[PDB]
Write an enzyme that holds these catalytic residues in place. Sequence first.
Site, PDB file in Angstrom:
ATOM      1  N   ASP A  93       0.824  -1.200   0.000  1.00 14.53           N
ATOM      2  CA  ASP A  93       0.000   0.000   0.000  1.00 14.53           C
ATOM      3  C   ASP A  93       0.862   1.256   0.000  1.00 14.53           C
ATOM      4  O   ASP A  93       1.866   1.299   0.713  1.00 14.53           O
ATOM      5  CB  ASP A  93      -0.921   0.027   1.216  1.00 14.53           C
ATOM      6  CG  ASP A  93      -1.756  -1.214   1.382  1.00 14.53           C
ATOM      7  OD1 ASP A  93      -1.406  -2.249   0.817  1.00 14.53           O
ATOM      8  OD2 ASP A  93      -2.790  -1.120   1.986  1.00 14.53           O
ATOM      9  N   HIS A 153      -1.284   4.477  -0.657  1.00 10.03           N
ATOM     10  CA  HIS A 153      -2.320   5.349  -0.115  1.00 10.03           C
ATOM     11  C   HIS A 153      -2.014   6.844  -0.302  1.00 10.03           C
ATOM     12  O   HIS A 153      -2.119   7.617   0.639  1.00 10.03           O
ATOM     13  CB  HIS A 153      -2.649   4.979   1.325  1.00 10.03           C
ATOM     14  CG  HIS A 153      -3.591   3.807   1.410  1.00 10.03           C
ATOM     15  ND1 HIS A 153      -4.765   3.754   0.691  1.00 10.03           N
ATOM     16  CD2 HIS A 153      -3.540   2.663   2.145  1.00 10.03           C
ATOM     17  CE1 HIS A 153      -5.387   2.624   0.972  1.00 10.03           C
ATOM     18  NE2 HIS A 153      -4.660   1.942   1.841  1.00 10.03           N
ATOM     19  N   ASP A 205      -3.901  -0.405  -3.685  1.00  8.01           N
ATOM     20  CA  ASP A 205      -4.093   0.671  -2.734  1.00  8.01           C
ATOM     21  C   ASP A 205      -3.136   1.813  -3.039  1.00  8.01           C
ATOM     22  O   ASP A 205      -2.284   2.151  -2.247  1.00  8.01           O
ATOM     23  CB  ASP A 205      -3.985   0.137  -1.313  1.00  8.01           C
ATOM     24  CG  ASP A 205      -5.246  -0.591  -0.893  1.00  8.01           C
ATOM     25  OD1 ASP A 205      -6.101  -0.879  -1.747  1.00  8.01           O
ATOM     26  OD2 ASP A 205      -5.333  -0.881   0.283  1.00  8.01           O
ATOM     27  N   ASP A 258      -6.483   6.925  -1.743  1.00  4.76           N
ATOM     28  CA  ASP A 258      -7.134   7.058  -0.448  1.00  4.76           C
ATOM     29  C   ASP A 258      -6.124   7.381   0.659  1.00  4.76           C
ATOM     30  O   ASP A 258      -4.945   6.989   0.605  1.00  4.76           O
ATOM     31  CB  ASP A 258      -8.004   5.836  -0.145  1.00  4.76           C
ATOM     32  CG  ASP A 258      -9.290   5.765  -0.960  1.00  4.76           C
ATOM     33  OD1 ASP A 258      -9.737   6.806  -1.519  1.00  4.76           O
ATOM     34  OD2 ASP A 258      -9.884   4.673  -0.975  1.00  4.76           O
ATOM     35  N   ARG A 259      -6.624   8.170   1.631  1.00  8.34           N
ATOM     36  CA  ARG A 259      -5.981   8.496   2.891  1.00  8.34           C
ATOM     37  C   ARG A 259      -4.847   9.500   2.714  1.00  8.34           C
ATOM     38  O   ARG A 259      -4.765  10.441   3.496  1.00  8.34           O
ATOM     39  CB  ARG A 259      -5.528   7.250   3.647  1.00  8.34           C
ATOM     40  CG  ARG A 259      -6.677   6.316   4.014  1.00  8.34           C
ATOM     41  CD  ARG A 259      -7.543   6.792   5.185  1.00  8.34           C
ATOM     42  NE  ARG A 259      -8.644   7.683   4.799  1.00  8.34           N
ATOM     43  CZ  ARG A 259      -8.821   8.944   5.218  1.00  8.34           C
ATOM     44  NH1 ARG A 259      -8.073   9.434   6.194  1.00  8.34           N
ATOM     45  NH2 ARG A 259      -9.701   9.730   4.613  1.00  8.34           N
ATOM     46  N   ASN A 291      -8.224  -3.139  -2.655  1.00  9.15           N
ATOM     47  CA  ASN A 291      -9.641  -2.974  -2.350  1.00  9.15           C
ATOM     48  C   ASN A 291     -10.020  -1.497  -2.443  1.00  9.15           C
ATOM     49  O   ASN A 291     -11.185  -1.165  -2.440  1.00  9.15           O
ATOM     50  CB  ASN A 291     -10.039  -3.552  -0.983  1.00  9.15           C
ATOM     51  CG  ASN A 291      -9.334  -2.881   0.178  1.00  9.15           C
ATOM     52  OD1 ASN A 291      -8.117  -2.694   0.150  1.00  9.15           O
ATOM     53  ND2 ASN A 291     -10.106  -2.508   1.197  1.00  9.15           N
ATOM     54  N   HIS A 292      -9.036  -0.601  -2.500  1.00  5.74           N
ATOM     55  CA  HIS A 292      -9.325   0.816  -2.601  1.00  5.74           C
ATOM     56  C   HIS A 292      -9.424   1.270  -4.062  1.00  5.74           C
ATOM     57  O   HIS A 292      -9.846   2.399  -4.315  1.00  5.74           O
ATOM     58  CB  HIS A 292      -8.305   1.672  -1.845  1.00  5.74           C
ATOM     59  CG  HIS A 292      -8.529   1.670  -0.363  1.00  5.74           C
ATOM     60  ND1 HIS A 292      -8.246   0.583   0.453  1.00  5.74           N
ATOM     61  CD2 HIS A 292      -8.989   2.632   0.428  1.00  5.74           C
ATOM     62  CE1 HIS A 292      -8.543   0.904   1.685  1.00  5.74           C
ATOM     63  NE2 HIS A 292      -9.011   2.129   1.685  1.00  5.74           N
ATOM     64  N   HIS A 316      -3.476  -8.437  -3.262  1.00  7.63           N
ATOM     65  CA  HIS A 316      -3.574  -7.355  -2.286  1.00  7.63           C
ATOM     66  C   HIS A 316      -4.008  -7.917  -0.931  1.00  7.63           C
ATOM     67  O   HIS A 316      -3.406  -7.619   0.092  1.00  7.63           O
ATOM     68  CB  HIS A 316      -4.525  -6.269  -2.795  1.00  7.63           C
ATOM     69  CG  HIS A 316      -4.712  -5.188  -1.812  1.00  7.63           C
ATOM     70  ND1 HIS A 316      -3.761  -4.239  -1.553  1.00  7.63           N
ATOM     71  CD2 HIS A 316      -5.772  -4.897  -1.038  1.00  7.63           C
ATOM     72  CE1 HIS A 316      -4.215  -3.465  -0.589  1.00  7.63           C
ATOM     73  NE2 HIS A 316      -5.469  -3.836  -0.308  1.00  7.63           N
ATOM     74  N   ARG A 330     -13.633  -6.313   9.221  1.00  5.53           N
ATOM     75  CA  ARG A 330     -13.897  -5.253   8.256  1.00  5.53           C
ATOM     76  C   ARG A 330     -15.353  -5.266   7.799  1.00  5.53           C
ATOM     77  O   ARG A 330     -15.826  -4.263   7.311  1.00  5.53           O
ATOM     78  CB  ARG A 330     -13.022  -5.432   7.019  1.00  5.53           C
ATOM     79  CG  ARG A 330     -11.527  -5.296   7.284  1.00  5.53           C
ATOM     80  CD  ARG A 330     -10.733  -5.639   6.044  1.00  5.53           C
ATOM     81  NE  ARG A 330      -9.348  -5.821   6.380  1.00  5.53           N
ATOM     82  CZ  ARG A 330      -8.433  -4.869   6.295  1.00  5.53           C
ATOM     83  NH1 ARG A 330      -8.826  -3.658   5.955  1.00  5.53           N
ATOM     84  NH2 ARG A 330      -7.147  -5.141   6.430  1.00  5.53           N
ATOM     85  N   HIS A 372      -2.385  -4.796   2.328  1.00 10.04           N
ATOM     86  CA  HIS A 372      -3.742  -4.562   2.831  1.00 10.04           C
ATOM     87  C   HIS A 372      -3.809  -4.160   4.303  1.00 10.04           C
ATOM     88  O   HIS A 372      -4.842  -3.644   4.751  1.00 10.04           O
ATOM     89  CB  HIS A 372      -4.627  -5.785   2.538  1.00 10.04           C
ATOM     90  CG  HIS A 372      -6.083  -5.700   2.876  1.00 10.04           C
ATOM     91  ND1 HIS A 372      -6.872  -6.775   3.266  1.00 10.04           N
ATOM     92  CD2 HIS A 372      -6.899  -4.663   2.725  1.00 10.04           C
ATOM     93  CE1 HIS A 372      -8.116  -6.346   3.385  1.00 10.04           C
ATOM     94  NE2 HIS A 372      -8.154  -5.049   3.075  1.00 10.04           N
TER      95      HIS A 372
HETATM   96 MN   LIG Z   1      -6.306  -2.268   2.448  1.00 11.82          MN
HETATM   97 MN   LIG Z   2      -4.582   0.003   4.152  1.00 11.39          MN
END
Ligand SMILES: [Mn+2]
Ligand SMILES: [Mn+2]
Lengths: 288, 76
Positions: A55, A57, A83, A86-87, A115-116, A164, A212, A239
């Site tokens: 990741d 991100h 990923d 995001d974030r 998954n993002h 991932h 989750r 992940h």
């Molecule tokens: Mn993740």
């Molecule tokens: Mn993550």
Amino acid sequence: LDDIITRLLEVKGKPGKQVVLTEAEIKQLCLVAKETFLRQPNLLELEAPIKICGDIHGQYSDLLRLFEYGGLPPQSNYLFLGDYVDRGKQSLETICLLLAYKIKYPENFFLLRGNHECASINRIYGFYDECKRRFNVRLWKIFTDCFNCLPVAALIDEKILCMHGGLSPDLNHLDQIRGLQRPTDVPDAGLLCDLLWSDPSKEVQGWGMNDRGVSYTFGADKVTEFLEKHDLDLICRAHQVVEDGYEFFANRQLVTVFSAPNYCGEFDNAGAMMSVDETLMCSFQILK
Amino acid sequence: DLLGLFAKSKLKKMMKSESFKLKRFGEWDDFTVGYIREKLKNKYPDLLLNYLNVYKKAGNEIVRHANNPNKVTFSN
Ligand SMILES: [Mn+2]
Ligand SMILES: [Mn+2]
């Protein structure tokens, strides 16, 4: 359109906290990368040597640190495990560069779906907003269409399986990944979901419901069984943020690689990359 | 006016009766786990994990052979 693409890389190769690309350029990266993903299979069959990152991100400056350490493409081959967005603050720079290098060195540079890379997720956890605020929402849909084509797993010298998330109760043969239909969203359940969402658990044996709220946990038993059944040596996944940037599971039959150092300015974790050499000796480069 | 295999009435009976449960699991084998999970509609997770962890048995059947002679190692 190789002249356009190198100017794009050149410009992205620079730090900041503002845009530097046009909507039409970003649109082009998404179109051309999408076509490249769809030429190549959904289960990638890669050879070592290769460098594997987890990741990011949107931590663009850290992505540049990783290419510093490993060598800018094509000095090394890369597999990223999803990923990208995001974030972080700079998802756009992050994904645009990664897509540019995919188009640029398609036999040497690879990106998996995280998954993002999914509309219902990146809707919420920042990417949609980054898109709206720096360009517009139309550029978000363009990325979505591109992400929906991202390949889902990779097999390295037929011995290291990379995805991932993790294993699936429905992953009985690897060619099932190859058969996953590409322009897709991530369903709520089933193989594709689990490949992007599942997690190893030290606490729960076998299959457990994932906290989750989608997919599963798998115990070290599942890993052992899976590697034995499919004649694999290692699972490589991401992940989950892990303090030391990488983290072994199930007698080192699996490893989690997370490449975003100090995630969200909060976790104080190290980021890692795993280098696989030609003999499949694996080593880890750390970022603090 | 029948019931589906995953009717709530049947899932409850499976919770209550080991023999009934075993019979239905027999049929759950005709479906993917993805299919089953969507059918359970986030209820009866105990049935699903029991199905996955207790009733289903894994092989020791090796179903693949990798043509790469290399074997993963970790550096110091
Ligand atoms: Mn993740
Ligand atoms: Mn993550």
